[PDB]
Design a protein around this ligand. Structure first.
Ligand SMILES: CO[C@@H]1C(=O)CC[C@@](C)(O)[C@@]1(O)[C@@]1(C)O[C@@H]1CC=C(C)C
Ligand SMILES: [Co+2]
Ligand SMILES: [Co+2]
Ligand SMILES: [Co+2]
Ligand SMILES: [K+]
Length: 305
């Protein structure tokens, strides 16, 4: 019998799977019975990092801007009483309204159109019938697919008033991300970002999840490079102009250890304490990076409003 690590439980049944009208272009895994991607299988095992063409950069700018618009739709719905399923429904419609496919939907049979990660959920939480509670923290992770390209971002949000521990965890996590982004430029080793993130997390009494990493993204949802967020990692590769990847630190109040729910997706702290995450998709430029998933109409993430 599965022993839950914290207070959270899945709230079933799920509403029937939401359809995407056929005029929306679909990634290859959308119609695979196990949600496997033939294009991913063909590239599996590569450590070759794509140098994006100008056409690819235009494709990544567009899908990442639309992904930010969809996260912003989700951010507007965060309040006590709203279920994660209701947020996912709004996200699904917002994706379709922008002629995008919701990348998570049927990815290895993932059942929903975004990931909603409350409290002790590290990542990949499945939207369900649980209403958000005053005091919760919730990550919404949006991945969209447009014209052959995926874009990926996430923010952690407060549900009503939260305690000082929630404030410190979310603020430190956001700082970890911005300190890592600020280091991105040609010639920096991908393994260096984890030293920066862990140094800031540890300084604030938090741990860094080891089982999940930032990743290459463009024609595949994940590919080279692998970008760990913890110190002294063995990530292979050196940043060059035209590289596109995510940085998405998952930081925990307690220990770093994770386990998975019987659903096969929900990653939780083994100790049941809270975890927060922020994510941007980055394009390395000749001298810095472009934050493809940046908020355009505000300097700050939603939790600071
Ligand atoms: C590199 O992996 C990724 C990782 O470590 C960070 C967290 C995820 C969710 O992005 C990841 O786990 C993905 C890409 O494998 C997961 C499949 C994606 C969805 C939306 C279900
Ligand atoms: Co993501
Ligand atoms: Co990601
Ligand atoms: Co995969
Ligand atoms: K969380």
């Amino acid at each position: 019998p599965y022993r839950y690590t914290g207070k959270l439980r899945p709230h079933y049944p799920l509403m029937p799977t939401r359809p995407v009208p056929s005029y929306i272009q679909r990634p290859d895994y959308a119609d695979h019975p196990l949600g496997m991607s033939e294009s991913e299988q063909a590239l599996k095992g590569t450590s070759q990092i794509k140098l994006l063409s100008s056409e690819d950069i235009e494709g990544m700018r567009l899908v990442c801007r639309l992904a930010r618009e969809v996260l912003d739709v989700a951010a507007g719905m965060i309040k006590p009483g709203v279920t994660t399923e209701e947020i996912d429904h709004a996200v699904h419609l917002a994706c379709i309204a922008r002629n995008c496919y919701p990348s998570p939907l049927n990815y290895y049979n993932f059942p929903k159109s975004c990931c909603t990660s409350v409290n002790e959920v590290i990542c990949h939480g499945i939207p369900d019938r649980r209403p958000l509670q005053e005091g919760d923290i919730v990550n919404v992770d949006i991945t969209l697919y447009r014209n052959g390209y995926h874009g990926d971002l996430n923010e952690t949000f407060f549900v009503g008033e939260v305690d000082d521990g929630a404030r410190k965890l979310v603020q430190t996590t956001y700082e970890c991300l911005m300190q890592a982004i600020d280091a991105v430029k040609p010639g920096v080793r991908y393994r260096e970002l984890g030293n920066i993130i862990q140094k800031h997390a540890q300084a604030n009494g938090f741990s860094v999840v080891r089982s999940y990493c930032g990743h290459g993204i463009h024609k595949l949802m994940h590919t080279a490079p692998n970008v760990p967020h913890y110190a002294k990692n063995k990530a292979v590769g050196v940043m060059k102009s035209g590289h596109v990847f995510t940085i998405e630190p998952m930081i925990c109040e307690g220990g770093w250890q994770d386990e998975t729910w019987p659903d096969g997706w929900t990653a939780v702290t083994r100790d049941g304490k809270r975890s927060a995450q922020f994510e941007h998709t980055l394009l390395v430029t000749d001298t810095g990076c472009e934050i493809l998933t940046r908020r355009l109409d505000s300097a700050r993430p939603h939790f600071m409003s």
